[PDB]
């Protein structure tokens, strides 16, 4: 083993370990060495290369590393291939800002290829930043040969999946009302929409729709979206609902019967009743006539019309509502649209053309009043969908899109999810399962530029569709030569046309790219270029035994993985999911670069070490709920846990070298009880840490290890230092080194998944072998001693109570005290075995175990004025004083009898009730008490001259020992000590001459009045002059 003497920062140690890992190919070796062992299949969720990693990203990569390292150590091969997510809106928008452009028209002007090249350059920059962060965090994952979603082979596998889905009839094009982002100018999927809901307040209005062929009669139409009123095509009523013609003032209003009293306020008179199907076909005047409707402006039956809210007459705009689209289509009414692709009014609405529709709500209300059609308005507090990338409010907008028909396999989705073990369990049928139950088809087409091109070609002539699964299939169908090096991106694939197998017409590729979530969802198949390559490796690497990503992937990678695999293979792509709560700042606020509360994990790693950051991320709280985090928690992990291990390790190395201990040599071992206890704690920790890790309880396993590390340092090492400090390799010293060597090797093995850097530094130096090539240690039950653990835990509690008393009464432990008495209710612990430990640790001359406190306490008596006030009147203070004057035995009698008589000054005898007296139990004179209920410790705090003088002699002994170290004197030489001090020091040194001589290797001791050029030292509150000569 090598020394740990030269001061090394945490960063320097981890850099040294990192280089050791590189030179030895330890990561690669930890995989290859498990060839033929059972597989544990792990999929890396690919980080989006559109920004810098923050400390929240360190949680998931820490947990994935713990799992992979642990499963490797317990006898599994864990292949770890990194991945980078590089397509889609999350990349495009950031690049647009870098370029100072915005929107699809600006991208066309900039140039599609030039824009895409900028995207490629940006993702490459971010990949390197993420790679460096991952390496310094110690998350072993192959970033030399990662999968990358922009790579041609990866895209080809995605094409093969999409082509296979198309073969089944599950990829189709349709004109549907879909959630739509007016800024990004594209439809969005249902999982993307679920990620962007925000509470808003807007206006729902009731508008009068004047009935044609009548007078003073208006329908009361209702809508939550005033901006859709110019596009009105029909009014919807329920067929079997009852409506009333109600007269108010000079007008008559048609409204639902159950809502009339709410809608019509002040005064009305119901004239007639009508069913919903009776009102069918009645024409009316639209609130706006800017747009011309060919067929419409009538009343139709819709089954979804409710009488619970609104008026029972619902304004329908077919282009901006799925129900509205369906009902208008059924009744053959003309479809109309008044909005461009940017969410702005077209020329068909003159007064508002070129304005965002949701910003016209206030002006629409005023226009409604001016036409005298407005009848009511109210505020609507509800959730509304916003774009998960650009924060623009969404619209529901009729649009031609491509869909993956996920609903066709909904039953298979639920069955696959039912096979998955979720952490936390509630996600399975909660956040994730509920999303499966409300499944709609997956809108995958994005009218964008940077992404996986949707590989569907349509014949211009007969609309036949061809979906090439590969470059070879693309080449086979193309009407022109297609080079083998064709890049599977826009615009290169848009220059490829096919010959239609049906009519020989020209086939053109649909222009869209696909949802970025499909790319990552395809990684089980695309990361190995399946089925074109690595068919056998893929089969061994499917399904995954676990994945671990943030909770937002329930609307992300968790869903897209499940959907792609279910549509493609029918099978669940994973057996087990760790759904991780998000890291927040120290205030509980979400982490963001804009908010400035996103800590840099690289700075934390540089300052405190990755081992400390990882430990704090694992041990401070559980990973399943939102997590408050701070630099302070990392600092505490470094000083309390990481530094403590390093110091114990450095202590062992220094004294093992000095004493020439050799773990390969065989010694006669005199194992002590403290050796047995720490070994029992070691293997009990091994057992309980393994049990938690087997159930992915990282926090509980970490906390268990931290407890053991505290016991190892604060108790085992601290109390065993003499056996390392002593000279000569006796049986006890050899046992100490043997015990500590086993603890350090096994503990570092335990810690290897958690704190990989320091664990290897200890283990490799002690054994010559990397800890990460080792097996996870097994619990040796023969070294577990449950009784010994139980007693030492009781001893620690007693020592803690004793220290508490000493601190409370300002009695420093260096000052010996006469006795500690322990009151125990039961003879559970063999206290005789720990007498020397308790007396040493508390510095008491005597340790006595008592069954009760009768010899240690007394009773004083007072009067309960709230209970005995009226009974004695003006004599209450005389009786209360009478109780306080009673002797110790009188109080002892009262607590046993419960009845008491007090004789007042006049001789008047009075009787005291049990509840009239307040009883106080006090320790006997000179004693002090602390109790935890189970144990009552009674300490004699009374000081004698002999006790004080012994304390002075102890202080003299320590002062001399400190002065010897300052002079670099040999530990073997005997010294001539000269000492000067006042009479109290002189008397103490004289009286305890034997004690001084036993603890100091003194050739002679001279007490002088004055010392020439002496060293003044501070012994207690006194100053003592020392001077050391050497025997000549
Ligand atoms: C599995 C990854 C997806 C396919 C996608 N590329 C993506 O979300 N990429 S990411 O880089 O934005 N996310 C990386 C991982 O970090 C999690 N995460 C993101 N933000 C936080 C946060 N504040 N606290 C904790 N974890 C967080 C993501 O869920 C993902 O696991
Ligand atoms: Zn958007
Ligand atoms: Zn054709």
Numbering used by the authors: 1 to 1032
Q: How is this structure described in the published paper?
A:
To understand how IleRS2, but not IleRS1, accommodates the non-canonical motif, we used X-ray crystallography to determine the structures of a pair of IleRS enzymes from the same organism. Apart from wild-type PmIleRS1 and PmIleRS2, both of which harbor the canonical HXGH motif, we also structurally characterized their corresponding GXHH mutants, all in complex with a non-hydrolyzable analog of the isoleucyl-adenylate reaction intermediate, Ile-AMS. Additionally, the structure of the C-terminal tRNA anticodon binding domain, which differs among the two IleRS types, is resolved for a type 2 protein. However, superimposing the HUP catalytic cores of IleRS1 (residues 50–174 and 523–635) and IleRS2 (residues 40–168 and 513–632) unraveled conformational rearrangements within the signature motifs in the active sites. Relative to IleRS1, the KMSKS loop assumed a more closed conformation in IleRS2, as indicated by a 5.0 Å displacement of the first Lys backbone towards helix α1. While the KMSKS loop is known to be flexible and to change its conformation during the reaction, we also found that the HXGH motif in IleRS2 is displaced towards the KMSKS loop. The latter affects repositioning of the first and the fourth histidine of the HXGH motif by 2.3 and 2.4 Å, respectively, and the Gly α-carbon by 1.7 Å relative to the analogous positions in IleRS1 (insets). The displacement (shift) of the HIGH motif in IleRS2 is of utmost importance for the accommodation of the non-canonical A/GXHH motif and emergence of hyper-resistance.
